[PDB]
Amino acid sequence: MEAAHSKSTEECLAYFGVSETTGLTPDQVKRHLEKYGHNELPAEEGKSLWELVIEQFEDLLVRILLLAACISFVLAWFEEGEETITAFVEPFVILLILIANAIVGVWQERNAENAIEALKEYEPEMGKVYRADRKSVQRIKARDIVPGDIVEVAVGDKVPADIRILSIKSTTLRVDQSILTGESVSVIKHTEPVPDPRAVNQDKKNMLFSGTNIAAGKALGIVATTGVSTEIGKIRDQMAATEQDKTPLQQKLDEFGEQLSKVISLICVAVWLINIGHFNDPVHGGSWIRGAIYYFKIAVALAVAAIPEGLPAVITTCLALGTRRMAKKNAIVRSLPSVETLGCTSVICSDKTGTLTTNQMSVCKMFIIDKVDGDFCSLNEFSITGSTYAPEGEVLKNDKPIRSGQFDGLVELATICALCNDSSLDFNETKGVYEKVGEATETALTTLVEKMNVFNTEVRNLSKVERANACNSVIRQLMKKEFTLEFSRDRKSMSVYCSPAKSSRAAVGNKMFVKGAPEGVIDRCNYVRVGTTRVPMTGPVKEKILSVIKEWGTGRDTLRCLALATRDTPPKREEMVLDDSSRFMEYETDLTFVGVVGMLDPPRKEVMGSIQLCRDAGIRVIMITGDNKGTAIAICRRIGIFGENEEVADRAYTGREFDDLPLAEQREACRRACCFARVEPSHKSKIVEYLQSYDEITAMTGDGVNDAPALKKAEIGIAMGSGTAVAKTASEMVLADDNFSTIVAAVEEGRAIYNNMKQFIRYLISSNVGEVVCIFLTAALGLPEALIPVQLLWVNLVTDGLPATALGFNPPDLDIMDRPPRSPKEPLISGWLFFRYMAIGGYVGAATVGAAAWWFMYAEDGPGVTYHQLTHFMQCTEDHPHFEGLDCEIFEAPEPMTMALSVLVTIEMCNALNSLSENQSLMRMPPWVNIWLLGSICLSMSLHFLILYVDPLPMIFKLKALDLTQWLMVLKISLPVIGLDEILKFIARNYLEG
Numbered sequence: 001m002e003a004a005h006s007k008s009t010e011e012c013l014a015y016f017g018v019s020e021t022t023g024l025t026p027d028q029v030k031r032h033l034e035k036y037g038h039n040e041l042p043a044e045e046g047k048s049l050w051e052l053v054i055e056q057f058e059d060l061l062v063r064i065l066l067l068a069a070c071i072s073f074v075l076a077w078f079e080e081g082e083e084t085i086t087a088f089v090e091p092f093v094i095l096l097i098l099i100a101n102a103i104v105g106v107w108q109e110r111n112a113e114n115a116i117e118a119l120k121e122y123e124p125e126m127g128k129v130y131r132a133d134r135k136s137v138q139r140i141k142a143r144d145i146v147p148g149d150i151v152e153v154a155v156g157d158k159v160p161a162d163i164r165i166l167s168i169k170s171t172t173l174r175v176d177q178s179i180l181t182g183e184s185v186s187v188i189k190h191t192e193p194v195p196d197p198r199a200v201n202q203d204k205k206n207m208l209f210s211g212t213n214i215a216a217g218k219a220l221g222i223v224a225t226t227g228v229s230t231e232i233g234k235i236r237d238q239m240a241a242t243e244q245d246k247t248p249l250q251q252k253l254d255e256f257g258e259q260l261s262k263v264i265s266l267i268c269v270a271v272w273l274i275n276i277g278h279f280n281d282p283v284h285g286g287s288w289i290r291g292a293i294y295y296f297k298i299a300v301a302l303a304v305a306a307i308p309e310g311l312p313a314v315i316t317t318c319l320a321l322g323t324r325r326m327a328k329k330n331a332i333v334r335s336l337p338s339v340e341t342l343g344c345t346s347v348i349c350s351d352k353t354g355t356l357t358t359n360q361m362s363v364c365k366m367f368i369i370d371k372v373d374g375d376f377c378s379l380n381e382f383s384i385t386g387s388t389y390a391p392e393g394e395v396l397k398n399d400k401p402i403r404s405g406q407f408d409g410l411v412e413l414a415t416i417c418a419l420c421n422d423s424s425l426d427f428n429e430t431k432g433v434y435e436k437v438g439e440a441t442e443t444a445l446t447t448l449v450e451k452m453n454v455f456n457t458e459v460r461n462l463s464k465v466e467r468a469n470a471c472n473s474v475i476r477q478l479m480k481k482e483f484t485l486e487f488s489r490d491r492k493s494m495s496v497y498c499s500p501a502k503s504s505r506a507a508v509g510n511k512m513f514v515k516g517a518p519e520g521v522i523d524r525c526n527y528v529r530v531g532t533t534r535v536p537m538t539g540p541v542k543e544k545i546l547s548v549i550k551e552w553g554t555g556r557d558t559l560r561c562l563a564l565a566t567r568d569t570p571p572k573r574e575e576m577v578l579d580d581s582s583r584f585m586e587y588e589t590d591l592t593f594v595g596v597v598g599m600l601d602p603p604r605k606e607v608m609g610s611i612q613l614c615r616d617a618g619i620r621v622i623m624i625t626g627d628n629k630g631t632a633i634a635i636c637r638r639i640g641i642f643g644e645n646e647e648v649a650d651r652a653y654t655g656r657e658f659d660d661l662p663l664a665e666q667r668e669a670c671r672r673a674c675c676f677a678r679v680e681p682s683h684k685s686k687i688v689e690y691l692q693s694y695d696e697i698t699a700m701t702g703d704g705v706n707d708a709p710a711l712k713k714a715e716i717g718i719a720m721g722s723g724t725a726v727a728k729t730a731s732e733m734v735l736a737d738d739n740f741s742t743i744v745a746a747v748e749e750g751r752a753i754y755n756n757m758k759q760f761i762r763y764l765i766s767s768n769v770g771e772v773v774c775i776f777l778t779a780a781l782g783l784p785e786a787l788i789p790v791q792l793l794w795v796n797l798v799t800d801g802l803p804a805t806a807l808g809f810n811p812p813d814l815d816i817m818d819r820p821p822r823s824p825k826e827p828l829i830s831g832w833l834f835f836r837y838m839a840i841g842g843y844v845g846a847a848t849v850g851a852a853a854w855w856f857m858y859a860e861d862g863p864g865v866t867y868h869q870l871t872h873f874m875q876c877t878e879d880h881p882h883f884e885g886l887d888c889e890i891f892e893a894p895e896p897m898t899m900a901l902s903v904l905v906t907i908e909m910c911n912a913l914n915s916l917s918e919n920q921s922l923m924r925m926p927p928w929v930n931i932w933l934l935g936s937i938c939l940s941m942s943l944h945f946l947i948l949y950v951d952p953l954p955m956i957f958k959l960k961a962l963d964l965t966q967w968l969m970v971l972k973i974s975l976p977v978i979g980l981d982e983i984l985k986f987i988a989r990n991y992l993e994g
């Protein structure tokens, strides 16, 4: 732990006692651990209090039912009667459903938090350090790094600790530190000290803060602080719900229930009005108050009844549930909307190298010049063996194992590979395998030279550790790397300025070794090295080279090709300005071509398959790579993006070709084209932006820093577990699995959550509308009431709860991933659905009245008021308007009423069997598809039985009943709801639109 960033490199180096180039001794490490602990934070625990999670109150339509319970608790406090209890049950028929939803939500959210922390804490964060026990850089669990030791970090890496920069390898080091200082753009660094021991972070321009990202370049430094003593480790705890808000679908439904408060609140105040004429009726005596409170009670209870108090929970739930599922497919969701947004995606843009392909690169072919004579050019081709980055394998000409150092071309070739190279290898002892350190393209090279072994170095007697870099090291001892012109994606090449090693001879030849994309480099070559010789680059020579490149690119191996050339006579260091990266290309001119390497880079298994599924789901998949257009197109084909034979000149463009088009033509180009090549980061962004200008939901997949902009501009960015931190930081989802499939599953889930939301809404609406059709039909048809306050609270508690919340666990529709994606601005409720909402609610409203009616009329154990209702109800006093006054006051019988309440429950528990699927028959999507649903129904049906037979209970509600017949009736009335929907589903099916 150093308190200084205001000291020099040495002071700091000596402070811990380290060799800036070698790193801490196994004993210094064992010690600093003991003295400084591991590089991490305690945390890892409770991200939400068991009680916090409970605040699945505080929402919209939950506060309503919350308050409706208060009033029914005050009214019960001011209620005098020998019936001082049916009023205390009320507040618990309301609280009850609220509680039930609360638990499920809470349960679902806890399981998700867990599942996630599982995925996260799975793959350990690794670090790059120089340590004494190894000559080359090695990778250690970041948790293990301690103050003092030497850390290396480069473009795209995440700073693993708080670090004092020692040496900046690239011409410039650019770091992104938004997570800390809040500075929006990348900032510059230097190795000079900053005196002021008070200075703020923003000014510590010689430090790298653990948790920032390197946006550009590469550097080595010495670790000042670890763990909690970290600039970002202190500030963790400190508040701010910087955790976003609600998802667009969450905000869509939030508003739908808001204006359902209106429609409902009105229909309520309505009931209070449509009656209040029964303000005097003998029932509540006739008081100038006892009649408006009863009906005020019927309103509130009708409200609680209609209001989908489960809506705010079920989204939340489906959400956390979708999350938990992705988490299980090794997908990390960084931003809640992602899965939903993903659901309705039309276009999936994707990087090639490393995203579409495995990024496991090996050099397997290479070539130099053989003979150059007039229009004749010939090449020395070679083959390499070994698919991994292991330094085991052999070079082969004509199937014969050749000794690389035998060909002068291959010597320089190797020299260049070794020297123009920011990456290295490292052998993982635990896993027992050679792992790259830096970019794969570069590392492939490193491996190549370990296989070339041109100076026939003795290696057979070297540990699996030393054998990794041995040769390269040799080459490294042979020249001094003065500085390097970092690889830049515009010029698409990279160079290295070198002088003679021991300084044996000064001015005997300074060099620049160059490595880059063939086309550009070859254009910058004036000469062609022939062994030790050199001759002018000519037409025929070039053509020969390029043509073999073309061959290898489009070949059945789709080789990823790089060119190596040297500048024999560089400018003097004094003439070279390293300030503007722009002038580097010139510094890389008048080159001498040396040779070409063909890299192997396998497409991922699951990719072709995922592409298909997208094609069926109506989803466009576009490739946006920096790589060569020929190679790229080749690969699209292998990936299924293009047919093995197919003219693509109209649908595949290079950044250059693309930029040549007029703006208009660019916009359109995006619509038809599926392959963009040799494109800079800006292009990747622009292409998405275009897709977006068609009001479409665009997805961007990638792994590298040239992907960030597009990753960031898309609706969802999906990063690779393998890819850069930079790339991850700009993503909503991260495939740790690196599995491409998950993307598709991810779109299937958001398709589903939506469908689930719909059916929920369908059941709540069509049912609860029936419930209000019940009332506004009897009270208007001049019929005796069908339900009382606590009778409504019951049809509620028992059909607006777990049976509904259960729809959340509906399976995917059978066609879900077979129809085009939903426009995001689509009317939540279609016109044709409102009809179906009504046609169901209507039939529910009436079948519930005709049942109470039927009890009055055709019930063989009831009276027989036959058709007409015998006209009316106005037959109070004995033999009143004598129209067969053979009965007294059967107009208070608890039977006609429980008759309806019983049907309501049942007919509702029926069209919830209709909310398995939008438009699929129970013949295709049967009830057992959703088991969680069935248990809920039985749960409710059971609650209804209890209420009807546990003697103390029918008092508090209404008189029991039904033995066969009476129940068989409820059934005869309710069951047809299923027949009506199953025809209604027939309609919208054998006439389609969605």
Ligand SMILES: Nc1ncnc2c1ncn2[C@@H]1O[C@H](COP(=O)(O)OP(N)(=O)O)[C@@H](O)[C@H]1O
Residues within 6 Å of the ligand: 352, 353, 439, 441, 442, 487, 489, 492, 493, 494, 515, 516, 517, 518, 561, 562, 625, 626, 627, 628, 679, 706
């Ligand atoms: N580290 C590097 N140094 C020099 N040249 C390199 C390099 N890594 C990549 N190249 C060349 O730059 C070209 C474009 O790189 P880029 O757009 O970043 O990704 P990609 N799919 O093309 O590899 C590559 O196709 C490659 O030939």
Ligand SMILES: [Ca+2]
Residues within 6 Å of the ligand: 303, 304, 305, 306, 307, 308, 309, 796, 800
């Ligand atoms: Ca309700």
Ligand SMILES: [Ca+2]
Residues within 6 Å of the ligand: 351, 352, 353, 354, 355, 703, 704
């Ligand atoms: Ca890439």
Ligand SMILES: [Ca+2]
Residues within 6 Å of the ligand: 305, 767, 768, 771, 795, 796, 799, 800, 908
């Ligand atoms: Ca209901």
Ligand SMILES: [K+]
Residues within 6 Å of the ligand: 711, 712, 713, 714, 715, 716, 717, 730, 731, 732
């Ligand atoms: K984004």
